[model samples]
Target: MKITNPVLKGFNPDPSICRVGEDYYMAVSTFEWFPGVQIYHSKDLVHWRLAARPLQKTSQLDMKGNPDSGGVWAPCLSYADGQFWLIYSDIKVVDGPFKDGHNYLVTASEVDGDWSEPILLNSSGFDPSLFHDHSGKKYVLNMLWDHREKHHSFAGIALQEYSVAEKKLIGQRKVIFKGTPIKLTEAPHLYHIGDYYYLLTAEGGTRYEHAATIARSSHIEGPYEVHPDNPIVSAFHVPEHPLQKCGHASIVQTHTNEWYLAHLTGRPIQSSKESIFQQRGWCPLGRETAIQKLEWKDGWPYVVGGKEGTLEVEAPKIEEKVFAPTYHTVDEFKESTLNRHFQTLRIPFTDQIGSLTEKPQHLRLFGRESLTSKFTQAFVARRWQSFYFEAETAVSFFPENFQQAAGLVNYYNTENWTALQVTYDEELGRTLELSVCQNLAFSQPLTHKIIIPDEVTYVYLKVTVRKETYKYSYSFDQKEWKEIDVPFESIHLSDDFIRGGGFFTGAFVGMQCQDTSGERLPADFHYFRYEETD
Candidate 1:
């Protein structure tokens, strides 16, 4: 049983794992996306399923106007006292004061069960973690952020005693280890092992120079000694490594006495010859989640494969258990509700955008704001898992004005996206129109509209992507397809293109409907099909 590197792929990052009995549960960060903190369940540590999403309701989590990489930062999951505990940061402000952020705690009896409402906690900083001590006392650990001028922003790690009975911190916050030679030190986690308390911190930054370092102290709060090797795992020194930006790790020990580290990594999907300083290529998929096997040398933990993480690795020996189905090629809309893989941009907005029972065998979406809106929009999509793939959907929409439209979109963020839409063309006198909309960088949105035959009420819109080239097509009937003359280049719709503004997230493909006039038009989509070509 060989566990593949990147046990979880795509947009999944900032992974935290914990084990209860033979079952393993893990959670990842979902900035600005609803159903925050995606939780996965695994038995053998290789195969996994989306067992639960703890932050379901708007009360527990909210990312109304969060920037591209805001909202939920890093989630720390732990099991203690027969319950599952989750500590996460809801970052509302990324710049200009940055005082609107706060940390919250939610707990449940089971991992897949309903989670309790959020319990507000101090927003001393982001990347919060809860550690239950061996003496039955609990503590909360996080990075203390200082925005004051002339002060270090990475103002060391903070520790405060938390009272389980009161559900709050009791004593004064104490500053622990300030970190090593690396700057931007954050994402701290504490583990009690043998006669030492180990502290793990991510440093250098979350970009190409990211790394993970460890230190140990005999006492919980005291002078800590950095590892002799300093950074146990990093990809900055090796620019040519396939897996880049490897850091922000969470350690987990299996029932078979095996230890593994789950960390964040990136793979540049495009070439990066324009910039001399940043050379690891361009990762359009953002920082992804990857796992590295850990081996103890003289009681110190080290990544098994050195600085470069592998794509395939050995799995822990345990009884494998099959859970739910992992992937789907088609969403038939046969069920009364959206599938677990379906997710929206900020909140659920199910009623405003999607409907399961409104029409049988079809998912009806009502149009609302445009795609550029930071607020709720009529859009739903899944992570782009592969570079070569085809997505198709049958859309039936009747628009009285040009503002009303429904289509398929390849989205990165508000400033960068590509879509093929079907709407009414006033220029052609209420005729059915097929259009291509592209928003890339400082260029004005380029839209190409063509009037189609009036008899076509339902059309099949398909997008085939091969590397950086995207080919779009539309068919009046399911048989005859007409490809758009222009093939769009997708390399610009990536992290490399948006690096100046500091955006960190992968791309997504999904269905969307829009009405700029506030008419709230409804568009019915019969089915959506996605297939990997390579």
Candidate 2:
């Protein structure tokens, strides 16, 4: 088989991989986006396919009133003693006594099954990861967040071994390694091989310069030294690259002795700041999976290229894998749940989404009134996988008030979005009309309302986006579309949109529906359809 790296690419980051037999499976972080923590399957560790999502129920988490970036942080996946275990942390609130929310673990006999109940692991300081030691002991590692520290120059990533049988920390936590030396050591992971434990961590921050570093320890606790050629993978090592900020990684070696790495990277979504808009809201934040091959040099392992694997182009060969020239946006409304193509605004409330194939060829969305209450919602959206793609939906709305406007929207947040919807007009004798509004110029635009002679029952709305242009269309019938002249600038991941003002990931294309008004009203979205048009 032809060998390639970055099996998956495009916003997929902080990856954890498991090599079961010849098959490879990976799980990556989805901060605030649901279904949280997507699991991908691969054969050669080059091509990856979405296998299943573990965070499928509201009871799986406490998302009632959550903060942005307060969903599933980093997830660690492993199969031990013949069962699959996926561990993660869900931060419902980010401040005060409720600050350090909850760490959860879900286990399943199979990677594709509905996971077991969440076993709370930690109480504070999120970003928990699991590592199984070769001696049958399991260790849980987490970031010790000292926000007041000017830089991560002082505090280091800590590790605490866990007793699986005791269900608790076996001993005191220890600072394993510091990140500043490598420029940043945010996500720390440990692996075992060749009678030595490998201490791997990410540094250089999560930006165009981000990287993964490694050191080996003769014992679990160590005076670990940075690898002579540390930063096993990095961007500066290969400057002027497309897949930049290549760190926060999880490495796995196949049973065949092939090794690979998974990390996240993204492009500027149009011309906007990198925020949820670029990472998870629209397209796959866990959007694409990337892979890399392992090269050995005197016991030290290095990659041929950047995180996606290598930059040196091998002899050009016919494309072996099918490239998705464009993606399908139309949903036939034939499934019982949201398709794999959708992501929630944040980690979702399980009660927010559902589908009944019995309901006359429709995907049913029980729009919750939490669009503004909680950062997470039951909105199934796909990564605006491309700079140019359109998302359309066919549905009927039963709004309780004007505050309960439900249609199709490119939802980033309550304050940052451009939505096309059908709503009750209080002034125009309660007529249904098409309205477009966006969080542009630092303010939410007054809802621009357009009237259609026909009532918008059995509605169809479509959005066409090109490299710097966006147009909306509405139709009563599947045929005969009405295009709107409301052109907008394409969104790019800019500074204003991101939290730490670094290399962020986003600019997504997905679908959303919610009741902004506090009336506890619901909106039923039929099915969201997205099509790629070059």
Candidate 3:
């Protein structure tokens, strides 16, 4: 069976994998999005399903004011002692010495079952992992951050003994491997294979210069021997490689004894020669998850085929079972529980921004602050999985003033988003008008306004996303569609186009209700329909 690359796609980054029996489980970072870490399950090592999200409640995970990419960092997943162990770091501060906020560990007997509450672990730095030795001893490993002036932030990887009895790390932490010549070394994972303890580390940051470096030692803690071919897997220096920004890898041995490496990679929209420093290759889809076959040569494992990973490869023959695809093409929002795909920017406060029980078969959103506000906003969204897709929703909103509005939005962040909304106009008398807002400029419209007939109570808004642009349309009776003149350039909604702060997330399509007056006006959504089109 042939399997395509990016087995998991869109907004899924920092891939980590572990195997239990014949089943394989994978986890990725979700940053400020609710439900925390994303867990995927697969039987054939190719097709995957969004199995479970362990951190659901606000108690377990709270990312209220976390900066763009400051919530959940790289998560390391491993299975040992008859339980699934998940280790992650909750970053509060983005820069300076306060960056090392907190780290926690959660465990469960089953991959899809409820996980135990996170046990607060030492936050020496970010990207922590646990290696349960064959001798029944456990150890916690992480990077020791040094924020002193002129000091490298990518401190050496540290280790400490963990007590199963106390369920916490014990003894003093010690440095093991400092790092290679490449800077920003982090995301370390330890594996015991044969007579060697292998240490895999991601170096050179997480951007265009990212890489996966390896070292090994006969002892668990010692002067390890670095791989001669230093960066075992990376596309940083290979300008022509189709898959770029490849690193942060985790290894998993299959039921058939085949070794594969699951790593985070991205496909830039611009040409290979285009430099990232120039803000080229704006990837609106964000970093993706890819798998590469691994082969053991001598005492070291190397990426199969070549250093540059391929987009498709031969699927491992561990079992013969149909596996579900990673994403869905359509959603009708008919289920009682919210779909696992839907996510909010931060921790939603009560039902102030959203509620499903208000109207039965309708999602009601109470207007709040504008999108740019750092506080709670009335919005819920899903990742833009495909470039060519159609999103349509029926919104029933009776705005008494221009401040109250509801509509569809393609949001990248608070600063970078475009919305087509229906807002009241006092000059136009009780009749409402449809307009578009870009970059959170609500006071000023980016497109000409079209008035809706006074008799019309509900409007069907549709957004069409083409290869490089997005087009908006609306209809009063769901029959005839009138296109909004402005076509938003999709490339501008990507990470490269970001001017300030940071860019680490992808674009999302969803619904929003806005009432700048703090009136808490409600907008009833009849239904939201999204479909992927070629």
Candidate 2 local Cα displacement, residue 442, angstroms: 7.6
lDDT of 2 by residue, 151-196 (tens): 4432677888887787777788887766646654667778887867
Best by TM-score: 1
Models, CA RMSD each: 2.2, 4.9, 2.4
Task: Give the alpha carbon lDDT tens digit for every residue of 304-397 in model 3.
Answer: 8786788886678766566554344545445566678888877843677778887777888899887776567788788887778899888888
Query: What lDDT tens digits, residue by residue, belong to model 1 across residues 201-249?
Result: 8998888889999999998896888989879879888777778889999
* Pairs of colliding residues, candidate 1: none
Error of 2 at 387 (Å): 2.9
Candidate 3 Cα deviation (angstroms), residue 123: 1.9
Model 1, global lDDT: 0.81
TM-score of 2: 0.83
> Which stretches in model 2 have alpha-carbon errors above 4 Å?
1-6, 9-11, 93-99, 148-154, 236-239, 269-288, 306-329, 345-358, 375-378, 398-401, 429-448, 492-526
Error of 1 at 159 (Å): 0.9
Provide the lowest-lDDT 10-residue window in model 1: 437-446
Residue-level lDDT for 403 in candidate 1: 84
